[PDB]
Write a protein that binds this ligand. Sequence first.
Ligand SMILES: O=C1Nc2ccccc2[C@@]23OCC[C@@H]2C[C@@H]13
Length: 306
Amino acid sequence: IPVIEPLFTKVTEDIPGAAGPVFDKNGDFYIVAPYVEVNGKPAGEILRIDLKTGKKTVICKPEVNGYGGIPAGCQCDRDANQLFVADARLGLLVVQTDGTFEEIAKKDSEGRRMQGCAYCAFDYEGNLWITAPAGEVAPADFTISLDEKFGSIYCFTTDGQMIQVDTAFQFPAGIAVRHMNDGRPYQLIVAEQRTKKLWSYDIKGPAKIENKKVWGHIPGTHEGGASGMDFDEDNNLLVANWGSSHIEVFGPDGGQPKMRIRCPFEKPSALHFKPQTKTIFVTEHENNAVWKFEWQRNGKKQYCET
Ligand SMILES: O=C1Nc2ccccc2[C@@]23OCC[C@@H]2C[C@@H]13
């Protein structure tokens, strides 16, 4: 498998659990710090990053009824400049740039308590596909599906339904939507981190997925596996391989990586393209920092750019 070794440039540092890189509609850059603690308990943060200096501004320190959040992954909305944030303690948040936030759902459409969420991805129809590797949200005790298969997959639809669409995953992590060239949502890809598998489904409509199959396999002997992922404009899937020091590059049909991207750090946790550029911003847990590098082509347009 060919490997490339592009130059990485440091963006910012000192971010506990750095993850959830995202750009809003104005081009501002944000990340999450899931692992910040105060008085011995979770107190994670959502931060805006000055791209010139790497200066960090805390946007939001989400807490609900005295239970602090573990914000873990982000996407930007289209019709309003607001961030959808997957939170491993609080479920799904909508965070405004002014710092105000709302917990969007605490129960699914079957009436059961939400599971804590980690990554999410909008399709072009505005439905948000979400991985939930944690156990029940606060006030339940915090657990994650690293060793047991209780992680779940949700779709939060444009009608405001939070629908559990699959379950029994061993730490579901990155998630991405592949669209037809004409814009129709076609496939959902889900990383099952602790089985080294990427799963695909056919998207038949809002919260409707069928044809579940193993789509690709993640290399590596390390502890970990696929974390965050996103498509480039050719529908190659770039997949951070936590613990392997690489981002894997899959062609549209999956299988084994057709190329690897060597990183100067062990634990890439998430990645996100800067809009209308070939620049990928990468969070990582070796140094708890953010970097950028130049890919071969632009990213796939995100929902917020449509
Ligand atoms: O892929 C991963 N994504 C994220 C994202 C946010 C916070 C922590 C993590 C992880 O850190 C070790 C346990 C968990 C698996 C890694």
